[model samples]
Target chain A: SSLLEKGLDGAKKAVGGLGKLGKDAVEDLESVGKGAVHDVKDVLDSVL
Target chain B: SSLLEKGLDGAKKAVGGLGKLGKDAVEDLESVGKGAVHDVKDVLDSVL
Candidate 1:
């Protein structure tokens, strides 16, 4: 009678995969912007 | 004269794969937020 839980096994793995993707996205962006604070801070170098 | 160049090349591919993943994450999170909105909005559910 657990109609909503039908095929329940798939949901856990679905979320598992999403977490991995989210983690990779975060890590890759971290690599991209890890130490670029200077680049960001210099945008107003000659203006302010 | 090429150490920085090598890093740039590596970053290019890194970001390239990352961009694809970033897009998926964006889309995935969007739908998640979207579904959550609808689920909660149905608090007053009455078949619209």
Candidate 2:
């Protein structure tokens, strides 16, 4: 239901949040954040 | 600028996403997710 949508929204927010970790931290979190985002999407897909 | 806002949005999304981690996982993630959310807020506040 809304669970998956919430997940996507959260995933988007996570991506947005990572962009604010400051200059160096932002760069550092890029791949890590994306990787997590991918996983979050996967989980959402499975649950959906 | 938008960084802090993004972080807050992301934190909100993350909180929402964690709710979909399945029943068992949702309960387990409650504190963990909250802890992380708190940390995210801290970073955002500091950056702002």
Candidate 3:
């Protein structure tokens, strides 16, 4: 689903000819990645 | 649970796998990882 979303975002950016859009998308993705790491750690604490 | 290990492993792989794919795909996978961390953290806080 993420791959799909990324692909779609890329396609839209391509069609729109928006260069900054690509960079912004990447930033958002990075932010999400960081958030996930924290969440996973929390879960580990609960179980272990 | 053992499944958590796999999930954690997958999360790590996903992080590294970002480099294998294009920047956009990398970004998307990163987002998933970030989200997972937060979700896991929330669960941990609840139990521990």
Candidate 4:
């Protein structure tokens, strides 16, 4: 659960943190969000 | 097949949702798609 929350937090920040970014930031939003979610999912399932 | 579909399907919604949105929508598309992919990947690979 903590991991989920952490991941969600990470996800939220990954995108929400950006206001008016460029193409590169937009791309960052994508990969960082995906990678963050991956980190979260990995940890949560591992615990399960 | 089902799990992959689930992720792909989820990503579809995010992109389609952005058709009407602007910068905000684009950001969401990235995060949402990434999260969706992460979900599918973890389900497919417990290795997460």
Number of the predicted model whose TM-score against the real structure is largest: 3
- Sorted by lDDT (best first), the order is 3, 1, 4, 2
Alpha carbon lDDT of each predicted model: 0.57, 0.52, 0.60, 0.56
Better of 1 and 2 by DockQ: 1
Per-candidate RMSD vs. true structure?
10.2, 22.0, 21.0, 22.5
Docking class for candidate 4: incorrect
Per-residue lDDT for B1-48 in model 1, tens only? 546545655766666676677767766875675565456445534542
Encode model 1's per-residue lDDT on A1-48: one tens digit a residue: 443333232454465567677767777675666335335335534443
Cand. 3 Cα-lDDT: 0.60
Per-residue lDDT tens digits for candidate 4, residues A1-48, read: 456546655765565444335445555656555555567556656774
Q: Residues A1-48, candidate 3, lDDT per residue (tens digit)?
A: 456456555655454444345546656665577568768878888988
DockQ of 3: 0.03
Better of 2 and 4 by TM-score: 4
Give per-residue CA lDDT, model 3, range B1-48, as digits (tens): 478767776876686456345466645655655565556556755875
Could you give candidate 2's per-residue lDDT for residues A1-48 as a string of tens digits?
446446545855665454333333434444455566666656655775
| Candidate achieving the largest lDDT | 3
Alpha carbon lDDT of residue A13, candidate 3? 48
Can you give the DockQ of every candidate in the order shown?
A: 0.05, 0.03, 0.03, 0.03
